[PDB]
Design a protein around this ligand. Sequence first.
Ligand SMILES: [Mg+2]
Ligand SMILES: [Mg+2]
Ligand SMILES: [Mg+2]
Ligand SMILES: [Mg+2]
Ligand SMILES: [Mg+2]
Ligand SMILES: [Mg+2]
Ligand SMILES: [Mg+2]
Ligand SMILES: [Mg+2]
Length: 112
Amino acid sequence: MLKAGVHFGHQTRYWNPKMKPFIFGARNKVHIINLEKTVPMFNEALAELNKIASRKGKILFVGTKRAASEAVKDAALSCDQFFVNHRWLGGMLTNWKTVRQSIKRLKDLETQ
RNA sequence: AUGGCUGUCGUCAGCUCGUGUUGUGAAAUGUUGGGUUAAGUCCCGCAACGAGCGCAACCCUUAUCCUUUGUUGCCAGCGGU
Ligand SMILES: [Mg+2]
Ligand SMILES: [Mg+2]
Ligand SMILES: [Mg+2]
Ligand SMILES: [Mg+2]
Ligand SMILES: [Mg+2]
Ligand SMILES: [Mg+2]
Ligand SMILES: [Mg+2]
Ligand SMILES: [Mg+2]
């Protein structure tokens, strides 16, 4: 059921064809998602995230679009996980060996 | 055939590498873009993240002042010559 609040979908422009099964679609030439399809998927995702946390893992929230910036740092501060709040540095994971020095370099400033 | 040394483009601001990513590949990106600088100088942005040789600084000299020392250098204030 509609556990959600009020979003009823968005993104009138440039709709991706391969998302047709998730589209309900109607008003004011703006697509609206099929929340009936969403709820089982969101619950399934929520259940899985838990399993991971239960084996002790990090989730690394990612959301860099202004609006959500503060929303992310807070949600990630709580739950003691980690987050990326601003521009995602290309290669932040593929070459972790190089960004590691930047972290170590950063740690130096805080201590000094 | 060479070492060493030297001129020259040019004291011009450029030249590259590690990892990552893109391309079948030669390669590309970074190093491009908006401003700015004498400067690849700096800031912002950005599949790039960092680094090196260059630029700048550290060197010599010149322009002001202070402390120390005062002869073979100096003579403001004192004595007569
Ligand atoms: Mg390849
Ligand atoms: Mg170049
Ligand atoms: Mg290039
Ligand atoms: Mg530029
Ligand atoms: Mg430079
Ligand atoms: Mg750049
Ligand atoms: Mg120099
Ligand atoms: Mg006299």
